[PDB]
Amino acid sequence: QEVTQIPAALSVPEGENLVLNCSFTDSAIYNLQWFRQDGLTSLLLIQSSQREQTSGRLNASLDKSSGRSTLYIAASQPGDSATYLCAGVNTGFQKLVFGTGTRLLVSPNIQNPDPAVYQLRDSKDKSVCLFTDFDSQTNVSQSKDSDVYITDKCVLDMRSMDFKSNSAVAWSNKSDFACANAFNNSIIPEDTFFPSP
Amino acid sequence: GAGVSQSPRYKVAKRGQDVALRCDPISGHVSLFWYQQALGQGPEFLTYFQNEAQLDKSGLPSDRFFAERPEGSVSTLKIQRTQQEDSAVYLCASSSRDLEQYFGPGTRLTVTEDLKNVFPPEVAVFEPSEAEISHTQKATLVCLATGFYPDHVELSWWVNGKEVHSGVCTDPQPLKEQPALNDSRYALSSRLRVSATFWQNPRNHFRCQVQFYGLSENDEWTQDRAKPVTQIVSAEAWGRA
């Protein structure tokens, strides 16, 4: 048995419906299970006779003729971001055979982009640069300088304020390090705010 | 009882040492399964028990890996003379008559050449910029956890002693501190964003806590520096008018 999951990685703007596919070479499936991994959270379990299963905005189908299972996620939310795994049990066996997974990123809809790079000082001469409030079409590139550390973007959600924002952090011990140049390897918006000290 | 449990949640082992991983299935479940999962990949079946009988051992490596479930309840996966390639997440599942498999939280195993490679994080908190406050009336705190190995950490934020989740984002993946090399310590960042009025209250206390899972009493330690045992490393800040 070989379980093929496509796509390996998927980026989708929040609000869109999305499709995850899972195909298996051996169509003699006893049970099909979909999981979420942020251990494994069981999402849905489809029986040999069943052609579909649903749990909230998640709906999975099992096509007995084309050897496929499709997971549909309706009105995607940034909180749906996780790895999704498909697995099947073959008739006459007990073990699950898994696909390699789909790494899903649901990007927040930034209703008011205000890109900026702020300098933050240690609570205890150490500082970090914070690139924040950029739209989700902006990607943060890894550092090209080995002694400059740059994280990937992260989505935070101030849920009582209906406000989501992206950010990435850069830091270094180098003397010439300044927030004006920290994110030089990324495509940063032309209107990015670099405040005065 | 109602869920599958696994112990230890994290394990760092010296290459050549044996390890033992425990699984407690859901109370009374007949079937018990072990799986191995490599980073960014899918779980791979190892072995299956029906009560105490190991009916399908087909996924176990040809040497050093042996599972036990002598009373048909608790199962132990033993890995003899560990090698680097054994580093993985080991997952246990159990099922009853309906045959649906329920998974445990897993054991994250890291096999390293020597325990002197193990380091706790250093933790620091960076206070919000006054420019962010005037530009947005929001205030972002950043926490940095640096220089740790293995990547067995849990970072959390606490406001006046209460854990907070809203407005937080911790990097899903750590950064390599030695990116050109194969052997590297790690760094991790997190943000907590609050309203500016909340940050401006000097009575508000913010703490970033990192639980690092490291060595036990049983592990030997010969380096002059402090033994890198499981511990909490934290940093904090108070609000500012």
Numbering used by the authors:
A (entry chain A): 2 to 32, 39 to 45, 49 to 62, 66 to 68, 74 to 142, 145 to 217
B (entry chain B): 1 to 31, 39 to 61, 66 to 81, 83 to 253
Task: Give the exact sentences the study uses for this entry.
The CD1 family of MHC-class I-like molecules present an array of endogenous and foreign lipids Ags that are recognized by specialized T-cell populations. Here we describe a diverse population of CD1d–α-GalCer reactive cells that we termed ‘atypical NKT cells' because they lack the invariant TRAV10+TRAJ18+ α-chain and the TRBV25-1 β-chain that are inherent to type I NKT cells. Crystal structures of two of these atypical NKT TCRs in complex with CD1d–α-GalCer showed that, in contrast to type I NKT cell TCRs that dock over the F′-pocket of CD1d–α-GalCer, these atypical TCRs docked orthogonally over the A′-pocket of CD1d–α-GalCer. Thus, variations in the CD1d–α-GalCer-reactive NKT TCR repertoire can manifest in alternative docking strategies on CD1d and diverse reactivity towards CD1d-restricted lipids.
